[PDB]
Amino acid sequence: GLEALMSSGRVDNLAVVMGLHPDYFTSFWRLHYLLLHTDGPLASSWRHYIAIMAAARHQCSYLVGSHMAEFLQTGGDPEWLLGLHRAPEKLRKLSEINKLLAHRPWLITKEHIQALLKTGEHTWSLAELIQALVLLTHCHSLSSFVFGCGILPEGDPPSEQSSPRDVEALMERMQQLQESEEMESRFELEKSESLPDMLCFVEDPTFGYEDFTRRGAQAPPTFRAQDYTWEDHGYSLIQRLYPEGGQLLDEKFQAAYSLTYNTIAMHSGVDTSVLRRAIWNYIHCVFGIRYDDYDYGEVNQLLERNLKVYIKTVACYPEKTTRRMYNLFWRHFRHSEKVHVNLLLLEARMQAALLYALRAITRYMT
Ligand SMILES: CC(C)(C[C@H](N)C(=O)O)C(F)F
């Protein structure tokens, strides 16, 4: 870990906890320095205010307070802190797509995109729009991480949760798998399986993953992953429209997926990719992405009930994550590994939210 930096306490609590995984932290920092503290299509103030709007969706005062203050240090019109109504209209057209990216990103559709790029008084460029989707999706994923890891605000420990044998059954069930049409059905099962200043920076403040305008549970339309992967499509679209951070996203996703230490709590010497794949592929399943190679039954085999709850809660309702919830799962796993799960899920989530919105753009582009 980056002990010296972490306890320097010249970087915020969020960044401290990321330090627990230096190989992720580097890719994390590059994107964060970029989005918030480097040139690019939108002015600093706008990038910080966009960050507020995304953070607001999960009532995440860590990121809202933070960005309010950056917005202010960077000479933002302090009147925008009184609510969206005072923001410029261009920045408010973003609310619809902000909401959806946060909660139901599968609902993003060419019309939503065509709304922004609709040539009017102040219009979004694709360059600007892409930066904003990266900004929105980033502060969402960082809201997950913030509640997920119990990250504490700076104003007066750096988390209320981290603090800087079924385990051997799990290692067995991993073994068997690595030793090796109803796959379309197992997906539909797993997907359907069910588990206040800020308000003036949002629309529809109660819109969430779950729909309370329909009886029964929420399950998003199944989407065949390989109609529009990051690898084949979304990356290419971003490096054409927001190159300087297209690569930093492809690098971050790569860094989170492939981050292993070959450790699985007590044990050295293990290949965990099966288990990592299962966390990844599940979270995508929660947002409706079905990979046609995956035996989606591997999920229930490998991810315990409490993990799935925490994961889904951090992904879909991070506001509602709690200490109980945090300890209740993987009782015997190291804290660091708890944090690792957060990395996996934030990147998995961000990628889905993006991919839906990129696909939306690629649709309006035709
Ligand atoms: C299983 C775990 C903890 C990863 C593990 N620390 C590893 O080294 O691969 C992660 F996938 F949650």
Residue numbers in the entry: 66 to 221, 233 to 240, 256 to 271, 281 to 295, 310 to 480
According to the publication:
The free amino and carboxyl groups of leucine make extensive hydrogen bonds and salt bridge interactions with Glu451 and Arg390 residues respectively, while the side chain rests in a hydrophobic pocket lined by Leu389, Trp444, and Phe447. We hypothesized that larger side-chains, especially those with branching at the γ-carbon could form enhanced hydrophobic and van der Waals interactions within the lipophilic region of the leucine binding site. The X-ray co-crystal structure of NV-5138 in complex with Sestrin2 at 3.3 Å resolution was shown to be essentially identical to that of the leucine complex with no apparent conformational differences between the two structures. The binding pose of NV-5138 is also largely conserved with the free amine and carboxyl groups making similar interactions as leucine and the side chain with the γ-difluoromethyl carbon making additional van der Waals interactions within the hydrophobic region of the leucine-binding pocket. NV-5138 and leucine were shown to bind to Sestrin2 as evidenced by a dose-dependent positive shift in the melting temperature with increasing ligand concentration. Further confirmation of binding by NV-5138 and leucine was obtained by isothermal calorimetry (ITC) measurements, resulting in estimated Kd values of 1.49 µM and 1.55 µM, respectively. Similar to leucine, addition of NV-5138 to immunoprecipitated Sestrin2/GATOR2 complexes rapidly disrupts the Sestrin2/GATOR2 interaction in a dose-dependent manner. The NV-5138 binding mode to Sestrin2 is consistent with the leucine binding mode and subsequent activation of mTORC1 is correlated with disruption of Sestrin2 binding with GATOR2. Taken together, our data is consistent with NV-5138 directly binding to Sestrin2 which facilitates its disassociation from GATOR2 and subsequently activates mTORC1.
Sestrins are a small family of stress-inducible proteins that impact multiple biological processes including oxidative stress, the DNA damage response, metabolic homeostasis and mTORC1 signaling (reviewed in1). More recent studies have demonstrated that Sestrin2 directly modulates mTORC1 activation via a specific interaction with the multimeric complex GATOR2- part of the pathway that mediates the regulation of mTORC1 activation in response to the availability of amino acids. Sestrins are thought to directly bind and negatively inhibit GATOR2 thus, releasing its inhibition of the GAP-activity of GATOR1 resulting in inhibition of mTORC1. The presence of leucine results in the rapid disassociation of Sestrins 1 and 2 from GATOR2 restoring inhibition of GATOR1 and resulting in activation of mTORC1 signaling.
